Ligand binder design. Sequence first.
Ligand SMILES: CCCOc1ccc(S(=O)(=O)N2CCN(C)CC2)cc1-c1nc(CC)cc(=O)[nH]1
Ligand SMILES: [Mg+2]
Ligand SMILES: [Zn+2]
Length: 297
Amino acid sequence: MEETRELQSLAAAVVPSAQTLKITDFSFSDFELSDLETALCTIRMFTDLNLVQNFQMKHEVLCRWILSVKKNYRKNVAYHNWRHAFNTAQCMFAALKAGKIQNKLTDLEILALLIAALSHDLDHRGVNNSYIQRSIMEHHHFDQCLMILNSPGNQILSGLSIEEYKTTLKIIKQAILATDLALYIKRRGEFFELIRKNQFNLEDPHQKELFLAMLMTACDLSAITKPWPIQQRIAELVATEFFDQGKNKIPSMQVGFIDAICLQLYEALTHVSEDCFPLLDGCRKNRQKWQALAEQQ
Ligand SMILES: CCCOc1ccc(S(=O)(=O)N2CCN(C)CC2)cc1-c1nc(CC)cc(=O)[nH]1
Ligand SMILES: [Mg+2]
Ligand SMILES: [Zn+2]
């Protein structure tokens, strides 16, 4: 099988440093990377967050798990595919390291966030696809996540005690549920209102959970923070999924997306951690770019 070959190659490969793979950079891009290379980057993410160590992950199991996750995204979907999931996780890794968020979280929270980031859009069929089995989409994504986590040879949480496991699974679930933008809109007010008054405190369980939710959305949307040539390309992908699947209004829509959803979030995040500023800076630069295009109609 192509996949048995794929596992062997992945399992046998040496994993380059985080620095070599550029995964610490907020401006990271995956366009030039093969599927195998994104798999290596993902291993390095688990490794340098001390997750392989602290939770006793077997190499071939983590490899198998990454390949299962990748396989359960749909290639024919223009934007919501493995590369979007991979990028979300990279942004999580970057925010944890470069953004210095790692120190504010527990190991179990970090484990959950990385798994959630990678898993949060599993089996997405594209924005214009919706079926009736009756945050519905997000429950399906989590279901896929759980299914892969319980599959033979893919159990990367096997090293956790049952108590750690249940705690981790619940964090993973809330984190994936949080990627529902309706949910983010409903909850962000509290977050912003809290930051506004310097009342925001991570030691409070309820606020911790709120922050994990906000962090998920920030990574999820982080293409909007990329260098202009990259953002332009990603916008092209989402435009294809939005309209093609299955006056140019796009620049105006992007400005509206940035204003309504993106700016305040990245603003809020930089307050929590000044080192996350490149996300806010990048988002502001893209607004300027899209706005100018919008002004030319
Ligand atoms: C680039 C072509 C247009 O893209 C958009 C148009 C409108 C809006 S929106 O804020 O008004 N709105 C629409 C209804 N919802 C689903 C919630 C959001 C968002 C985007 C957009 N989304 C993403 C994330 C998938 C990335 C991105 O770059 N742009
Ligand atoms: Mg989603
Ligand atoms: Zn997403």
